[PDB]
Amino acid sequence: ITGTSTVGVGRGVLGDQKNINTTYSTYYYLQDNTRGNGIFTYDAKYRTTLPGSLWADADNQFFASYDAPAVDAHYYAGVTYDYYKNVHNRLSYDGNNAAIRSSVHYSQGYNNAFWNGSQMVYGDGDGQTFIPLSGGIDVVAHELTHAVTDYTAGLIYQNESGAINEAISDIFGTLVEFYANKNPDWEIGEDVYTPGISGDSLRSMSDPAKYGDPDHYSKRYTGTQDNGGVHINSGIINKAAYLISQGGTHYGVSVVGIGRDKLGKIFYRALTQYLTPTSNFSQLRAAAVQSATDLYGSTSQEVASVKQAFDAVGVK
Template sequence: MTLKNKWMSAASAVVLSASLLSVGGAASAKESDPAANVKADSKINWSEQFSGKVPSFARGKLSSKSVHNEKDVKKFFKENKDLFKIDPDMKLTFVKQETDKLGMTHYTFVPSIQNVPIDTSRVMVHTDKDGNVVAVNGELHPGAPDKVKQSKKLSKKDALTAAWKEIGVDKSQADKKVKTLKGEKSTLTEKSDLVVFNKDDQYTLAYHVQLQFAEPYPANWQIWVNAEDGSILKSINQVNDATGTGTGVLGDTKSVNTYYYNSTYYLFDISKPMNGVIETLDNYNGGDSYLPGYYITETTNKFTKEREKAAVDAHYYAGKVFDFYYNNFGRVSWDNQGSDITSTVHYGSNYNNAAWIGNQMIYGDGDGSTFTYLSGANDVVAHELTHAVTQTTAGLNYENQPGALNESFSDVFGYFLDPGDWLMGEDVYTPYKSGDALRSLSNPPLYGQPDNMSNYQNLPNTSAGDWGGVHTNSGIPNKAAYYTVNNVGLAKAEQIYYRALTVYMTPNSTFSDARAALVQSAQDLYGSSTASSVAAAWNNVGVY
């Protein structure tokens, strides 16, 4: 899918001039300019992603009347139908209304056809404390039909069966029951939701099936099944790879929170303000057959054995990531619902990866040459757990520009946890080569990434093409983050990035949309001067 986004601002092709709002020119302005009803200082990021030119992100003073509820929002869309090209009564399903600590209110809708949500899409309307609409963003789908052609002939169970058949895995292999300190737990998560699947403006009634399991291999399968005939529309395994006291991987001593039960200490942390726990287990290099693994125990509350080093770091850094999100943003675990943070170390044999697999973390030991124990890097742990945060907030699709943003935001939050340098994974990558790393936010070309849109890599949206270059093109927003931190400082950058990820960004956000989300977040939090500094950071990498 080709994304054609253009940033229109006072410095470029469109300025919503005051004359468009004058009484005398109102009628002709509406005929010639779909944005005629919004105010003069508004900025619109146009998208032609879904057959029709509509805003993917509009910000500024967008309304002349205050908005205070769902009904008012729908009235706003009707008054601006030439701009947004959507019937809010037929095509938008209200999800929630939230007011944040700044007094801003955020209305979330899902684009729908016949009350069935269009998958991986969201529309958001944001108002200030007085009810003025200051931003609208998301996926509007102006070309969506009023009805889908298909009828629902499959049940959720039928769709699950088709999905298992598609991936060639026997469900019994993945559905293992293990005993934990909290009771018996399944290693499998299954979900099947009726949605409308869109590809190249073809809208199909489908089931979105999610299969998350650890054996016979780590998987976070996202599969779309035609609800009428059972054919597979799309499938992708979205495992996100990151190419007492205890002793960590690098030989340092750490204090770790443990749990004492029946004369035994466990790497099991119940000290955090959450419903769940932080638990760390050992796969014993058993791979798929031994997940989530075995509890790591000691009788003396000292975890200093060689084999325990990877577990100590995974446990300690998971706690630090929890603390970072909780202390800085009030977020309670990766889903903000206080769910367990489960980590499994010593996964597989010579496994050169760490991954969030949709419901837990796994860490390989590396092959000793390319990587050592991957849990030994706090930025790697933060990177992977940020994928979990993204999964439950913006939901950035793992392909093309949204996928590159998914990777970039994980890198950026990895830096926020480890701001001593601009490198990612340097503590565990090529252990016998000092100063080496996976990526650099300050100098992406050092590790083969572009740092400007002039060098954007148009790679195929296939596994071989890294789903449109998600690990390659992430260098561009990474460099923008580097400029942002230097422009506004670390503390402000942390708040701006978190707000953009959790408030403004949506599943199909492009680089231009991310720029707009970050600029708007800066404006919300710190005012126009900081917003201009963020905009300048993205200008530096050719994103407008």
């Protein structure tokens, strides 16, 4: 809609207060004109029709419980936009400043969030397994990174390529969580998963085996569930990414950590320059080694650490 750019205030899913960019035209709308072609947040009104109605508010204050998922969907889309622009010089998910659209209150008791090819969709959860999923910055950034992957490498969502696709989304989801300094960790979804249970998450990048996911190629899942294990076998790549950043000794292989910024630069370059739709784990290793070589030199510590990390998880 056309109107005046304003700044409102509200509270997110976890009760935290934050400022959000709105647009004023009789009502205040969740329309952020300051980022690319805009960030737009919609109310799906517990239906499955998309996108729903552009979110309208009478007073530019978003403190009602019904508002909370919209506040966070809107705000964390903005943070994700800022991460890709300021850190990687990428303008929105398509690199051409496409508008980011999100719908909240999708369906009823819906325990999921997804990028559907043109927009973000957030369930409210059932209040036991999940609370509204836009409350997790790593979830928001994980799903938006699927859009980045679709517009670059085109990794297919099954078998090893699909596990790489998932891991890429976990890696950048976590780097956005650190970038925002929002209670950062190497877990996925901890802020919105099982509100009754402290200290758990959907999966761990630092210790995938904590939840039974593999942390070595010899332990990879080879069945047909989960599109061939895309959310299971991602643990192998997630552990490698954790080792590249933080270092450690894993199955007897010592890895010298090089930090989060260089992890992001290496994987972003691998994704945008070298990966293809059917890349497997071995080709990811080659792409990461080449990317580190491009950026830091063939004899650099950065290249050595990438090699060490993939050796540690058994990917040659």
